[PDB]
Design a protein around this ligand. Structure first.
Ligand code: ZN
Length: 213
């Protein structure tokens, strides 16, 4: 028993860290073209996300976070709080301290953590096949070494660059639309034919012309 343990049921009207932690876990279920706010307040958007999560794993979908809902999260949660199929190291091929960015190392890792939970949801929705992560966090040095953009969300811990795997670039960019990625760049967008870029953060910008987006 390590990362986090929920003490009791959560429903609309609840507020606190327990709510903030659950929002992270279900951040991959905000509805198409939406983003869940991680504010610690259990409102209607939070109930909807929970319902979607419950449905995705064949639990009773009532939108109430009870003990069965927590037992499923416990099955997807690693010691360090990351989901079972993604790790911090896989999300940072830059350095080992998450320093260098446009925000704190702790803010960078927390932003990363949400991205991991969104990827976990997407991994299951796509059929439980491995999703290849090619890059994630980039300090300012790392970003320049790549010739990245000055504004790049990579330096915030919000983005991940995905390789084709058995899904293909387009399948990944299309599904990303359902999992809280406000920024998606892929095939047909300049410098994005050899990977699919997904990122969280404010402001929606979707472009992958070769994929129909
Ligand atoms: Zn990228």
């Amino acid at each position: 028993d390590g990362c986090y343990t929920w003490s009791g049921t959560l429903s609309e009207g609840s507020s606190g860290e327990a709510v903030r932690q659950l929002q992270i876990r279900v951040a991959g279920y905000p509805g198409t073209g939406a983003q869940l706010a991680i504010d610690g307040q259990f409102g209607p958007a939070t109930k909807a996300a929970v319902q979607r999560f419950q449905s995705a794993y064949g639990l009773a979908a009532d939108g109430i976070a009870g003990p069965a809902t927590f037992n499923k999260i416990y099955q997807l949660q690693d010691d360090d709080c990351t989901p079972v199929n993604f790790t911090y190291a896989e999300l940072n091929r830059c350095n080992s301290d998450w320093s260098g960015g446009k925000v704190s190392a702790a803010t960078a890792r927390a932003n990363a953590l949400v991205t991991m939970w969104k990827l976990q949801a997407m991994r299951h929705a796509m059929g439980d096949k491995p999703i290849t992560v090619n890059g994630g966090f980039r300090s300012v040095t790392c970003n320049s070494n790549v010739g990245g953009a000055s504004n790049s969300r990579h330096m915030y811990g919000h983005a991940a660059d995905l390789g084709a795997g058995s899904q293909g670039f387009c399948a990944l960019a299309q599904a990303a639309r359902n999992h809280g990625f406000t920024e998606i760049l892929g095939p047909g967008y300049p410098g994005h034919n050899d990977h699919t870029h997904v990122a969280g953060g404010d402001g929606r910008f979707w472009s992958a012309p070769s994929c129909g987006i």
